[PDB]
Amino acid sequence: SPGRSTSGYITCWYQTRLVIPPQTPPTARLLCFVSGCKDFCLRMARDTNLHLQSGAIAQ
Amino acid sequence: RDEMSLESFLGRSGCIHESKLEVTLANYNKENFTVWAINLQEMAQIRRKFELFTYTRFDSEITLVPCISALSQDIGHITMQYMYVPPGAPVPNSRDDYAWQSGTNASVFWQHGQAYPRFSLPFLSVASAYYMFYDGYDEQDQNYGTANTNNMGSLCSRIVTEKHIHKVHIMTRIYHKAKHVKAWCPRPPRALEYTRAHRTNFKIEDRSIQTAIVTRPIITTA
Amino acid sequence: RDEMSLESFLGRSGCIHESKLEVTLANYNKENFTVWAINLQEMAQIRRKFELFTYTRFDSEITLVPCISALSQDIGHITMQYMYVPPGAPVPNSRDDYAWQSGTNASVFWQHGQAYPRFSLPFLSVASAYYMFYDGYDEQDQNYGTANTNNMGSLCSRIVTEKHIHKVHIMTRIYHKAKHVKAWCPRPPRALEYTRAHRTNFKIEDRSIQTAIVTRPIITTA
Amino acid sequence: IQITRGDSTITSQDVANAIVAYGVWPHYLSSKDASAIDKPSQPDTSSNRFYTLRSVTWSSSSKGWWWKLPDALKDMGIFGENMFYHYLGRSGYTIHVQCNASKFHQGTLIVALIPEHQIASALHGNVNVGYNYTHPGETGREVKAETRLNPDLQPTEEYWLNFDGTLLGNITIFPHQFINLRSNNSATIIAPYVNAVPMDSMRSHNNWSLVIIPICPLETSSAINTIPITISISPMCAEFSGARAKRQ
Amino acid sequence: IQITRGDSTITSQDVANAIVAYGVWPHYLSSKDASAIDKPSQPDTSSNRFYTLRSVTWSSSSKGWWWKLPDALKDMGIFGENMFYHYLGRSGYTIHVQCNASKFHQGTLIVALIPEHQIASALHGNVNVGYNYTHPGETGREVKAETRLNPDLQPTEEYWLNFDGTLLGNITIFPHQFINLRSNNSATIIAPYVNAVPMDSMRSHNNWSLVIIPICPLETSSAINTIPITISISPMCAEFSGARAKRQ
């Protein structure tokens, strides 16, 4: 379960702004990925809370 | 990482079906028997877990938990007959159908005060795995999504006793457990409510698409 | 000195909790289920024994002793469902909550005339031991004394049968037994009555501090 | 003799007839027990020196005093800063309690180091000890008769009950040393880190708790009828983790 | 490539075609040259990382900028604190100047590191440069046309005279590197400590002085007609002496 005082932060800052030549899009997008490492591990299975089924599921 | 193995994730037992049977006085046969086509897609939690892969293969362990309730007039001793009808075999349609005494089917008799019934089933499909998803169609080019090779048979139940019947209710929780599990081709987790069995449909009438993603006011503040 | 080993001193089984459940007619769900957060500090005798050390580690053995009492109208056959909810998992809050059929939780069904239920639990904490004492605070700097890593889960129980319910009382004594025990940093024995759970508080209102020390008139006479 | 450790050096420590808490010598966290697999290294002798608190006055009516570690050193140069600018940390100590008296003074102290010394609140009812009072800092906590504030937040004053419902006189079950003025005038305890986890939030959890109770009242015929008790604490194998930017 | 040093890591440093001031590589003070006979040791890789100042804006009218070392880093975490809590200190550096531009930008910078860069005051007469203005900090000093205060304390603005009465264009006699946008876009200088004594009062004496003059004006047809100049400085073999109590 998520903690605030027990959690870290990833912050992104402009060291410089976007520099571009003439006739070029003044803005550009940035993507962010995440995965666990070799040392990543889980224990004691429970039910995911990211999926709550409150429907019919009619066949 | 042992607890993160497929065997640990999918191999846990869960209640895949609730089966209620009520004694009806009008006709002896009536619809006293109950027939259910085995399907592990009926429970959302269980479904989402398996739908994490494209193909899965495994053996099964069915455990039955009978719950008898007597409104009145005793009738304490009753014998239950649970029957498993293999894929393709004819299912009963009367409390006294021949199916109930056939030897190709598997039956287990349970009388209250007895240990909970339990039996195993091997991998049933004619294919090498069960399809969690199917980008294909029927032979008639219809009912796309569902796969015929995926059939697992039916669980049936009938009250065997005769007249001691005094309008009593029977609840039978069916627990299934995937054993010796194998899975292929992982897929992203289901993000929306299910709406149909055997269909990835997600659009619900007069309701906005709701994901698990929680929105925040500003992205500079975590 | 074999009987003076930790295994002998703390490894004995005792009744850590009494759980009563009464059939209520108004609403089917009601609060028929019972939920109890496992805690070995509720019984003074048992508490003082463990509080003889600072840190302890051990596995558990839970044994359940159901006592059914029927005021009238039979209802002799009823099925009980005892469920163990691991630390952090959501606890049920209705007799028909989904928790009762979840596979991550452990459940054991008991129908009268059956051997007493029993199961084992491994060392649950995220730390290497359970804290018998904690000179620390919460993350909010509050509720000092109690330790979050010490959570052991919950024991739940619900009547599974449906209408055969004729207002009957259910008593369930819960016996726990510490197995493969280990302890660290012995402390002096508790000398006063306990007043709070998770707090060494001892002052009682309008009552003088009373120790086990018996006073004598003169010290020259034993 | 004198034990010079760092830029600090305390005279009168003498021979090594001190006690080593639970027989375990302060050690650096081994990789096997470590929480995050292993850390490349944690060698820093910078925080390893002697911090000498102000001397407390022992009078004929003194009932007791107690400090909590690491709390007491939260404001002691390097160590203090280190524990303030890091999320986690672990440390052992070398507590050195000594008092100046003459052959004409008599009295006895019990110097005990208690692990997880969970104090009990002063009042009855549903009350509990408040953060501020279990974190008095280097000033420590003196047993007083005077009435204080946030009373229901205050810890007990029953020193003879070890401040936690147990009997003083059984307090000897913890690492300790007696200070019988007519025999010795100092005690020393070398304690390793004690907890159920590798490291912890030094801010929220006090592992050790130094208690000092006068079992035999101080008596003397001198002009000033009180003597000083000097306490010197030295971190042992201090380690920290999750360092944050300082001076920000 | 990227040079990761400490908890800091700057990308785009690439190959090692940098200049090593006066051919001497930054080294620790040898005992032979030491002032107080010799010191047992001074090994501390804690202050050895990259401090990246705010990027300065290079416009078509920019005339120049200059920073002084160690001054510029007086407020940079560890290094800054170290030089504040010590009487004496010595250090080399690895200055890394780089600017982002495109193949449609043209311009040239002279990045020079001047030893003992004694500035000349702006006004005539018996005036001299005031402490505050030669110690601008990490902000640096930009060549401006605007009028300032304590004018007779202000340093000159004559960049083409190297700010000290010499001719720009002879400034190449100091360790330097040109940044011709159409060729390279970064320069790197590794300079050792330079002084007539082993160590010094970092507060009162700035050994090196980083100067950046646009010899060829920046020109471009882009929307925004200015580019950023990023400066990253990393202490080399930093050593300190006469440490004083902090947090007091």
UniProtKB/Swiss-Prot annotation, chains B, C:
Subunit structure: Interacts with capsid protein VP0, and capsid protein VP3 to form heterotrimeric protomers. Five protomers subsequently associate to form pentamers which serve as building blocks for the capsid. Interacts with capsid protein VP2, capsid protein VP3 and capsid protein VP4 following cleavage of capsid protein VP0.
Protein name, per record: Capsid protein VP1
Summary of the function given for this chain in its UniProt record: Forms an icosahedral capsid of pseudo T=3 symmetry with capsid proteins VP2 and VP3. The capsid is 300 Angstroms in diameter, composed of 60 copies of each capsid protein and enclosing the viral positive strand RNA genome. Capsid protein VP1 mainly forms the vertices of the capsid. Capsid protein VP1 interacts with host cell receptor to provide virion attachment to target host cells. This attachment induces virion internalization. Tyrosine kinases are probably involved in the entry process. After binding to its receptor, the capsid undergoes conformational changes.
Subcellular location as annotated: Virion; Host cytoplasm
Superkingdom of origin: Viruses
TM segment ranges: none
